[PDB]
């Protein structure tokens, strides 16, 4: 029974591998050789946000490119004003162990989650003046790794029980469940059109899901160790990942394989976060060796370094107008670069 | 429209910062601990002496303590174990013993000790079931740990009254297994405090209090470059 099933799985794997092999016409580096290099990129710290008592685990930029939320170990959730460095809100959490936070695309809400297996949604439009828990979504059987709003009533979570889900915040139930991975899921990224999303798990693989169908579309399995970060290309046709083997990679949805690899022999630390530029020419990655690296996405050449943190870099994001980069770290500081 | 809203921003920032200074005052006066150990070890009775994660509050001599027990998670520790990298101490509970359980206990201790983000945490080690060990020995360790036949009780052993050395040798053998794993590495940056507890005991909180006091004293000595 299991013998012929394993044989047929191996046969299908070989058929898929040969199908991809018959498609590698020419390497991406072979095509972008004549393109003039970007040149050195210098970025300076413009702001420094100083209010967290302990490590910082996550952050998210508002769609207005001005405000941002951040989470920390002390049990706080602080909303900043990056232009003027003024704290707007500071929400105290019931559980001190939070691993993620998201900021709604409309600006009316903010989410968080962590080791308590629960996603809490906070209503910022305080009719009476105070911020209070709108909804507590409890259906997972493992910690929460990431969460991203679709709109004011839908949110996608990824968990440490090898499962992602889609929620109806009004009812508090699970609309759909995405069950393909065989390890903890550590990140997710929503498409520009928000009809698909990709996840990264602790089995060195990534998958492409259909939010409305509820099924896996494609699987990308280049990496060697656990995947920690994931992000789409601005086009929506490619994405980049970052894993524990001190490497980043670029995958394409239409060719169904890998295109580029961003690594060096002197880099032996894992990547904690990736992000793209507004045009998709830069690729920013934060490492465990206390600093960030800027990559030329088309030629795989380093273009700069963002070294301003004393402990490891845990999160990284780029505004929606592409004007600034915010970097959080375990030394309890955020820094805006430009 | 401009200056008045700037004033409002500054007022909100000031109020937030005042609440944050009060919170910071509260946050530094509490010591957080992580309680580990397998199910058969006997963590439940230890907790009763004092959902993805649990929590217990107790204070000794007007000093506040937190203790966190992992609830409904999976058996893959390599990811959620990094959240506990700046707790005061880890309390590792072991039962003196169906496969080889002591080897899994020793392997988990070795993994915790050498982890990159847990190289500054000290472990308060409880060797729990000292009565089951008393009966089992006087009724085998050589067939799972073949170094036992060449083990002799340390000179500085403290035997309980009315106890035959037959169990004292096994007690100190297991303690020395954990302690010899401990000193193989660590650069002297963290320490292990092993204790021989029992199923029922009235002084586990006192032992944890003394061990945490020593841990914090050594940490302060080390942060002034005096150690």
């Amino acid at each position: 029974e299991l013998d012929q099933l394993r044989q047929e799985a191996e046969q299908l794997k070989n058929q898929i591998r040969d199908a991809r092999k018959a498609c590698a016409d020419a390497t991406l580096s072979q095509i972008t050789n004549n393109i003039d290099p970007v040149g050195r990129i210098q970025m300076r710290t413009r702001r420094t946000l100083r209010g967290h008592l302990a490590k910082i685990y996550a952050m998210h930029w508002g769609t207005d490119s001005r405000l941002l939320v951040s989470a920390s170990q002390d049990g706080k959730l602080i909303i900043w004003d990056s232009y003027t460095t003024n704290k707007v809100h500071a929400i105290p959490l019931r559980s001190s162990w939070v691993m993620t936070c998201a900021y709604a695309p409309s600006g009316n809400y903010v989410a968080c989650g962590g080791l308590d297996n629960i996603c809490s949604i906070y209503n910022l439009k305080t009719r009476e003046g105070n911020v209070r828990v709108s909804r507590e979504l409890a259906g997972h059987t493992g910690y929460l790794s990431c969460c991203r709003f679709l709109d004011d009533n839908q949110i996608v979570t990824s968990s440490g029980d090898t499962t992602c889900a889609l929620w109806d915040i009004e009812t508090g139930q699970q609309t759909t469940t995405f069950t393909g991975h065989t390890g903890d899921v550590m990140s997710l990224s929503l498409a520009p059109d928000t009809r698909l999303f990709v996840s990264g798990a602790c089995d060195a693989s990534a998958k492409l899901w259909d939010v409305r169908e509820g099924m896996c579309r494609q699987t990308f399995t280049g990496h060697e160790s656990d995947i920690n970060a994931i992000c789409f290309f601005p086009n929506g046709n490619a994405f980049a990942t970052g894993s524990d083997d001190a490497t980043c990679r670029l995958f394409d949805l239409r060719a169904d394989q890998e295109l580029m690899t961003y690594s060096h022999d002197n880099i032996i630390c894992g990547i904690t976060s990736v992000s793209f530029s507004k045009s998709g020419r830069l690729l920013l990655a934060g490492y465990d060796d206390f600093n960030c690296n800027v990559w030329d996405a088309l030629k795989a050449d380093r273009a700069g370094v963002l070294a301003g943190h004393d402990n490891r870099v845990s999160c990284l994001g780029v505004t929606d107008d592409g004007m600034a980069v915010a970097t959080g770290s375990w030394d309890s500081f955020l820094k805006i670069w430009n | 429209d401009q200056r008045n809203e700037e004033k409002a921003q500054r007022e909100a920032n000031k109020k937030i910062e005042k609440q944050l200074q009060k919170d910071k005052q509260v946050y530094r006066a509490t010591h957080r601990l992580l309680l580990l150990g397998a199910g058969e070890s006997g963590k439940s009775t230890i907790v009763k002496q004092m959902t993805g994660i649990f929590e217990t509050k107790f204070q000794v001599d007007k000093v506040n303590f937190h203790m966190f027990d992992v609830g409904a998670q999976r058996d893959e520790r390599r990811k959620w174990i990094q959240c506990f990298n700046d707790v005061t101490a880890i309390i590792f509970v072991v039962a003196s013993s169906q496969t080889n359980r002591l080897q899994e206990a020793l392997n988990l201790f070795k993994s915790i000790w050498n982890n990159r983000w847990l190289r500054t945490i000290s472990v308060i080690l409880f060797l729990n079931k000292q009565d089951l060990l008393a009966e089992k020995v006087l009724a085998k360790i050589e067939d799972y740990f073949p170094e036992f036949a060449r083990y002799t009780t340390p000179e500085d052993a403290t035997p309980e009254p009315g106890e035959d050395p037959r169990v004292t040798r096994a007690k100190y053998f297991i303690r020395d297994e954990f302690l010899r794993i401990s000193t193989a590495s660590g650069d002297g940056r963290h320490y292990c405090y092993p204790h021989f507890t029992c199923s029922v005991d009235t002084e586990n909180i006192r032992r944890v209090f003394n061990d945490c006091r020593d841990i914090i004293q050594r940490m302060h000595l080390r942060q002034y470059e005096l150690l």
Partner: nanobody, 126 residues
């Protein structure tokens, strides 16, 4: 893609010998510490031995120490185990498990019910 494939095993007489092999693909064999784990009938998985990146540090379980040997070939990308002077209680399925991350000295989840970086196992019977 990470793939570990065990070979060797079968039925041997008590007091006999065996030699397992595990061929690794999809990663650099030279950056990872390698393990061997086993699962007896009706029981859970149990760690058996491991070998360092270079091949210097080696450890064994108490019950197999003296008989079993673990060795690796970084050039040929293969992991070995020599199981001589067997006993009936040594019947189980043996897996080669790799530590999750490179350049590390700890290995957490090799002896776990659903681990992503080990093979399918070879039945060894006595």
């Amino acid at each position: 893609q990470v793939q570990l494939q065990e070979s060797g095993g079968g039925l041997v007489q008590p007091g006999g010998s065996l030699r397992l092999s595990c061929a690794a693909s999809g990663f650099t064999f030279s950056n990872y510490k390698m393990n061997w784990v086993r699962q007896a009938p009706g029981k859970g998985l149990e760690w058996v031995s491991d070998i360092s990146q270079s091949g210097a540090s080696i450890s064994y379980t108490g019950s197999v120490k003296g008989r079993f040997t673990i060795s690796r070939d970084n050039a040929k990308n293969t992991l070995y185990l020599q199981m001589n002077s067997l006993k009936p209680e040594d019947t189980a399925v043996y897996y080669c498990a790799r530590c999750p991350a490179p350049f590390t000295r700890d290995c957490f989840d090799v002896t776990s019910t659903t681990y992503a970086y080990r093979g399918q196992g070879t039945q060894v019977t006595v």
